């Protein structure tokens, strides 16, 4: 019986994957322009919340 715990673990794992992909794309864009990225602007919190 999957309760709230492993259920939210599954959804949170998916959304963490999406967040990692998002920051990957952002930092790759900034690096390919030839400049270090800002970590704060990388995170899009609304993916999770």
């Amino acid at each position: 019986l999957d309760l709230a715990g492993p259920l939210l673990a599954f959804l949170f794992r998916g959304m963490f994957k999406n967040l990692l992909k998002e920051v990957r794309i952002y930092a790759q864009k900034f690096i390919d322009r030839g400049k270090d990225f800002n970590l704060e602007l990388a995170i899009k919190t609304r993916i999770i919340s």
């Binding site: 673990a9 930092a27 690096i31 390919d32 270090d36 990225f37 970590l39």
Partner: protein, 87 residues
């Protein structure tokens, strides 16, 4: 789920590596949750009682933060290892 599954999912994440050369590394180490706190329009944090969430049609939720270690190599091991706390 809060005490174990969240931290385990974070630590089990593969550390993101990025490359042009400039070799950027990202790692997530420690997690935090505050109490359920409402941020007003001006960003004032206030302890949100659940009856307010019922009455004001708010989602009874707590913020979540992570300590993030960003280690950048620059083709010559001049490693800048910054850390961002409560991100």
């Amino acid at each position: 789920f809060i005490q174990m599954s969240v931290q385990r999912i974070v630590e089990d994440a593969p550390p993101i590596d990025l490359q042009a050369p400039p070799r950027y590394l990202l790692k997530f180490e420690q997690i935090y949750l505050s109490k359920p706190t409402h941020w007003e329009r001006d960003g004032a944090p206030s302890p949100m009682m659940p009856n307010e969430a019922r009455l004001r049609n708010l989602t009874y939720s707590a913020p979540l933060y992570v300590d993030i270690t960003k280690t950048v190599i620059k083709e010559g091991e001049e490693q800048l290892q910054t850390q961002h706390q409560k991100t």
